[PDB]
Design a protein around this ligand. Structure first.
Ligand SMILES: Nc1nc2c(ncn2[C@@H]2O[C@H](COP(=O)(O)OP(=O)(O)OP(=O)(O)O)[C@@H](O)[C@H]2O)c(=O)[nH]1
Ligand SMILES: Nc1nc2c(ncn2[C@@H]2O[C@H](COP(=O)(O)OP(=O)(O)O)[C@@H](O)[C@H]2O)c(=O)[nH]1
Ligand SMILES: [Mg+2]
Lengths: 48, 22, 432, 186, 431, 48
């Protein structure tokens, strides 16, 4: 699994990781909007 | 060199063209 | 003494509230000034009170429809403390009525609830009148229903919410307010009754030959539905249906509590004489889809539980015959797990007529409140309207800015999809 | 503050890498966010200020408004990333006549304006990361006849990625720069 | 108890708003002297929305008048219905901005802003429960387009929870009344997209076609156009002042007509218009007003609404009418021509009724439209901008008042962003 | 009784319901309701 992750990271470029701090968020957006197919599948799983 | 609403996609990158037009 | 406290919220709540208390006062002979018409009579009229005050609350954040009651023909029936107004209306926003500006008045509203609860001896239930399309009906309605479940337990909550028509609407954010309000009626309302304005228009246009109906004509017969269902408490009869009889016989399951409505003898004054109106044919016309107050086809689904409430001179012999004729029809379909599918209530008082009202004097009437799986037909159309408007996320900055978050939209939508699944599972049948 | 605690040469006022980056800096957000993000090209944790409005969100080095800062050095060096967005920073100085003069540079203007109290400045930047060398003494001598004494406030209200803002006595290139001040490490 | 502060800026705002208070005084029964002489109690039920009670029982309008040239206020004060206004509210200058946005918004207008904002703050704090601030001005000029938008930006900081009803006239397509119309229009629209909550768009040329084709006025005077504009302004606020079966205040209109925070430019039109040669032949019914409502020639905007889809349209009906006729006519106008309406918002029409029709008419309606065809107006002004901007012509008058040329590029890149989202919403489809 | 009857029939019911994916239910109910509205639009009344 680590070799597969390193193989992915060798081409995926240095991704800006999430903040360990997240010091301030005035609008308090929180979670983002999920995509259409992913949201439909998640809603279907939750309703199942 | 090289999920989100249409209004938000306009508003996020609008300030870049605000710079660029000058 | 058995009693029900009613709550009228929003524009549609108290316009029906003007119509319902117009019919309530005429049923019991109460004059518009509040007093029902030797030394004791002088004492009973001036120093004491023979006045009867309603057990209602007329609250709206917009004062224009509230002060119409304060300056109308019924200014003396209601207590001035009893009618609650506001500065700024919720303005077609569930966010304003539930979080920002409905929070200030809901504390004042419960104080007048506490005075009405202390005045009564024994409480039985709560009537809620609102529209789920408007901000005050949805927002302040959900806020009041959420708080009424906290302070009061074992006291039922009856809901009469005017749901939006599938075709015509008077607002654009109409799908948003109804979806968010629906999650509150599932969670906090014991019994909710669908009402659809377009279905009332078709009843007024066709069976009552009014080509140009207004909201005054609609609310006069919606008040007939509301007055008939609580009429077993006010008047005696051969068979009674109390407000706790109504819950125990029309909700097989706690989540399914959505019932339709119908009034059978919607006949004009000219058409009444030629019409023969016996129990056999009004019940046939009660199940007629043209006579329903919700724009839905009951043949799409199947009835789960149905309550036929009767007014006037109806013997128990022929209501049973009307039960048997309905059960043998192939178009009216019952679900297989409810063999005894009917509850029949008889009230000896004939239905009173509003003076100047469109309806004629009839000696027989049926108020048919039925639990059917055709409610999911209504919520599916209102869901597809919600999914198209939420895909582009329009009309969301109004809701997000006034207290609500983005997650409440997906949460209330997910509850409604469960209800869509709930009807399809409960309405499933076992064969062979 | 910062008058007795005077160090020879450089004086780091805010460094992003550490256990607690916002140790002395006050924070203020309005329709924006402050976010410690490890960037792509440097792969190092840098602070980020973002906002839809420039004047709403800011961070100021003196936490209390009444208190003041003191650095006698005439150079302020900020290492910031160009986000192709609005940038804006503001430095208040105490001049010879014990007067408060505020030099306020921004990306949304092209002509400099010198009011008797506040001077406004244009800023043009390169493509990627950058360091800006705000010469306090030279800028106050060009703007007014007086000379620099101390800096009372430094405040960035922008959409940027900051790390290694500090004070310098004079211009110091890469080969004489101290060990941990590079951000390039050749 | 809901109440609106009126602010009139510039020669256009003073002249239109002089005619606006003529209708409101006549609707509420206020005489030329100011005293109440109405014949119905329903007029007097809500007077505090626009008028403040003074000594003697006469009512002064809640109007603040601003212009940097004393010529316009002489016409307003000395004209008919000119004694109702308060002379303290006549906050005005001497030098004159003179069609320059830089003079009205940065240099010359700024010494009067602290004076006009003082009397607006006095009018706002004295009254009890505000709705917003109704502002009438122009965009081709510089005294009202300049000083008015400075107040709009400043009054948003003081009161952020209140709305900004702006009635701004735009440059005409066929004609220019000032040579610097593309400068002032682009520089004011950018100052209105982030400040004004909702915008009503007017122009002289659309009202000229209304006065000639429908009203058959071959010589339509300067106040005849203002009378049509004044009838629209009263129609917007009709549910506040008077009761109805479906009351819709200012916040209900903006929560319905605005899908996204920058799509707040609206086109308007007054429905029951007919000439005296055809007054006795018109059958004033709900179908007849609805036929005249949705026609392109009835709109008071230069943009042709057939070119784009209505994102959201609202109508403020007045008169003793049945709701079902209002319900079924606006249901029918969607179904007959559904190409001209947007598809991803079901039920585009916001319908509301007021039981009191205006004086002299048994039935009336006021129409609001958020059509994406209004992008043709902003495209034309921006086309007139880049022709004039690329040569720095008439530009040193703007930069001579301390303005950078950044604000020019700031203005149109928000104008180009505004017209870009109008095009993309029309093209967008659901499923 | 529970294990022989109720658990079995509820297992069959929940299996069929979980097999039913919700989007099919909304599509079918939307089509049926639109058919009813089309009939009551183009037709003078609907009779049972
Ligand atoms: N049956 C009936 N329905 C009404 C009546 N008045 C309003 N409605 C319903 O109300 C809906 C409009 O929303 P409203 O109830 O007016 O909203 P509101 O109560 O004013 O809440 P806010 O707008 O926030 O003040 C319409 O779709 C109608 O269905 C009425 O008199 N009778
Ligand atoms: N409809 C209408 N438009 C007007 C009126 N007065 C001026 N305008 C328009 O306003 C524009 C000129 O504005 P201007 O008088 O220079 O405003 P100022 O710069 O604020 O003084 C022209 O395009 C006119 O068409 C009026 O009474 N009615
Ligand atoms: Mg209301």
């Amino acid at each position: 699994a680590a070799a597969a992750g390193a193989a992915a990271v060798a081409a995926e470029l240095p991704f800006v990781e999430q903040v360990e701090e997240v010091i301030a968020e005035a609008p308090v957006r929180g979670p983002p909007a999920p995509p259409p197919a992913v949201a439909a599948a998640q809603r279907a799983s939750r309703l199942r | 060199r090289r999920n989100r609403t249409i209004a938000e996609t306009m508003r996020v990158a609008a300030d870049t063209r605000k710079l660029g037009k000058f | 003494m058995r009693e029900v406290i009613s709550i009228h919220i929003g524009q549609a709540g108290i316009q029906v509230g003007n119509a319902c208390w117009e019919l309530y006062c005429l049923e019991h002979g109460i004059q518009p000034d509040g007093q029902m018409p030797d030394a004791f009579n002088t004492f009973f009229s001036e120093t004491g009170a023979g006045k009867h005050v309603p057990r209602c609350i007329f609250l709206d954040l917009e004062p224009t429809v509230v002060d119409e009651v304060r300056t109308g023909t019924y200014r003396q029936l209601f207590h001035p403390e009893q009618l609650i107004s506001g500065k700024e209306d919720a303005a077609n926003n569930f966010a304003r009525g539930h979080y920002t500006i409905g929070k200030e008045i809901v504390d004042l509203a419960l104080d007048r609830i506490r005075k009405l609860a202390d005045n009564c001896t024994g409480l039985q239930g709560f009537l809620v009148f609102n529209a789920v399309g408007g901000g005050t009906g949805s927002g302040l309605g959900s806020l009041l229903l959420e708080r009424l479940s906290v302070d009061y337990g074992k006291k039922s909550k009856l809901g009469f919410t005017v749901y939006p028509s599938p075709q015509v609407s008077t607002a654009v954010v109409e799908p948003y307010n109804s979806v968010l309000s629906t999650h509150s009626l599932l969670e906090h309302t014991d019994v909710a009754v669908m009402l659809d304005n377009e279905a009332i228009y078709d009843i007024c246009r066709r069976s009552l030959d009014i080509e140009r109906p207004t909201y005054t004509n609609l609310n006069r017969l919606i008040a007939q539905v509301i007055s008939s269902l609580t009429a077993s408490l006010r008047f005696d009869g051969a068979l009674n249906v109390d407000i706790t009889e109504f819950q125990t016989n029309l909700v097989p399951y706690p989540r399914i509590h959505f019932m339709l409505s119908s009034y059978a003898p919607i006949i004009s004054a000219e058409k009444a004489y030629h019409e023969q109106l016996s129990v056999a044919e009004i019940t046939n016309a009660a199940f007629e889809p043209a006579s329903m107050m919700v724009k839905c086809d009951p043949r799409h689904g199947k009835y789960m539980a149905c309550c036929l409430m009767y007014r006037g001179d109806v013997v128990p012999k022929d209501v049973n015959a009307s039960v048997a004729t309905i059960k043998t029809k192939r178009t009216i379909q019952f679900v297989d797990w409810c063999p005894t599918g009917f509850k029949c209530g008889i009230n000896y008082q004939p239905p009173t007529v509003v003076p100047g009202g469109d309806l004629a004097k009839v000696q027989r009437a049926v108020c048919m409140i039925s639990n059917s799986t055709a409610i999911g037909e209504i919520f599916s159309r209102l869901d597809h309207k919600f999914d198209l408007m939420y895909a582009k996320r329009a009309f969301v900055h109004w809701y997000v800015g006034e207290g609500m978050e983005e997650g409440e939209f997906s949460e209330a939508r997910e509850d409604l999809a469960a209800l869509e699944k709930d009807f399809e599972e409960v309405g499933a049948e076992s064969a062979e | 503050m910062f008058k007795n605690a005077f160090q020879s040469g450089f004086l780091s006022v805010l460094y992003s890498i550490g256990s607690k980056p916002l140790e002395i800096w006050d924070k203020q957000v309005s329709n924006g966010h402050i976010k410690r993000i490890t960037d792509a090209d440097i792969q190092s944790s840098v602070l980020e200020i973002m906002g839809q409005n420039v004047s709403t969100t800011y961070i100021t080095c003196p936490a209390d408004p009444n208190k003041t800062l003191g650095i006698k050095l005439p150079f302020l060096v900020l290492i910031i990333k160009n986000l192709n967005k609005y940038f804006s920073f503001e430095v208040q100085v105490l001049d010879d006549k014990n007067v408060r003069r505020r030099f306020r540079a921004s990306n949304y203007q092209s002509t400099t304006r010198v009011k008797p109290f506040i001077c406004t400045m244009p800023m043009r930047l390169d493509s990627g990361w950058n360091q800006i060398q705000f010469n306090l003494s030279d800028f106050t001598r060009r703007a007014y006849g007086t000379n620099y004494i101390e800096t009372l406030r430094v405040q960035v209200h922008a959409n940027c990625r900051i790390r290694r803002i500090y004070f310098s006595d004079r211009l110091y290139s890469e080969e004489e720069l101290p060990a941990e001040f590079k951000l390039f490490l050749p | 108890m809901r109440e609106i502060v009126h602010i009139q800026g510039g020669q256009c705002g003073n002249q239109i708003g002089a005619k606006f208070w003529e209708v409101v005084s006549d609707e509420h029964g206020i005489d030329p002297t100011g005293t109440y002489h109405g014949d119905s109690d329903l007029q007097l039920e809500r007077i505090n929305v626009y008028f403040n009670e003074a000594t003697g029982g006469r009512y002064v309008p809640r109007a603040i008048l601003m212009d940097l040239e004393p010529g316009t206020m002489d016409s307003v004060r000395s004209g008919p219905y000119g004694q109702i206004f308060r002379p303290d509210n006549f906050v005005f200058g001497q030098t004159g901005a003179g069609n320059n946005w830089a003079k009205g918004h940065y240099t010359e207008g700024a010494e009067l802003i602290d004076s006009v904002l003082d009397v607006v703050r006095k009018e706002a704090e004295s009254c009890d429960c505000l709705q917003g601030f109704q502002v009438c001005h122009s965009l081709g000029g510089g005294t009202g387009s300049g000083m008015g938008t400075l107040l709009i930006s400043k009054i948003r900081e003081e009161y952020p929870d209140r709305m900004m009803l702006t009635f701004s006239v735009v440059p005409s397509p066929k004609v220019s009344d000032t040579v610097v119309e593309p400068y002032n229009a682009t520089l004011s629209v950018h100052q209105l997209v982030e400040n004004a909550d909702e915008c009503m768009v007017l122009d002289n040329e659309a009202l000229y076609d209304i006065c000639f084709r429908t009203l058959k006025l071959t010589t339509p005077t300067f106040g005849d156009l203002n009378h049509l504009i004044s009838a629209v302004m009263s129609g917007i606020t009709c549910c506040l002042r008077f009761p109805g079966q479906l009351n819709a205040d200012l916040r209900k209109l903006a929560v319905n007509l605005i899908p996204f925070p920058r799509l707040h430019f609206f086109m308007v039109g007054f429905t029951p218009l007919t000439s005296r040669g055809s007054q006795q032949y018109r059958a004033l019914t709900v179908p007849e007003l609805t036929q005249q409502m949705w026609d392109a020639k009835n709109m008071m905007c230069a943009a042709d609404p057939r070119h784009g889809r209505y994102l959201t349209a609202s109508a403020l009906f007045r008169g003793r009418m049945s709701t079902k006729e209002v319900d079924e006519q606006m249901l029918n106008v969607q179904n007959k021509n559904s190409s001209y309406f947007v598809e991803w918002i079901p039920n585009n029409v916001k319908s509301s009724v007021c039981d009191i029709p205006p004086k002299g008419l048994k039935m009336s309606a006021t129409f609001i439209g958020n059509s994406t065809a209004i992008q043709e107006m902003f495209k034309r002004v921006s086309e007139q901008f880049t022709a004039m901007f690329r040569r720095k012509a008439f530009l040193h008058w703007y930069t001579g008042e301390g303005m950078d040329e950044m604000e020019f590029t700031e203005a149109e890149s928000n104008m180009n962003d505004l017209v870009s989202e109008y095009q993309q919403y029309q093209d967008a489809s659901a499923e | 009784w529970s294990t022989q009857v109720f658990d079995t029939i509820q297992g069959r019911l929940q299996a069929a319901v979980d097999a039913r994916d919700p989007a099919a239910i909304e599509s079918r109910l939307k089509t049926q309701y639109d058919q009813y509205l089309h009939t009551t639009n183009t037709k003078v009344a609907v009779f049972r």
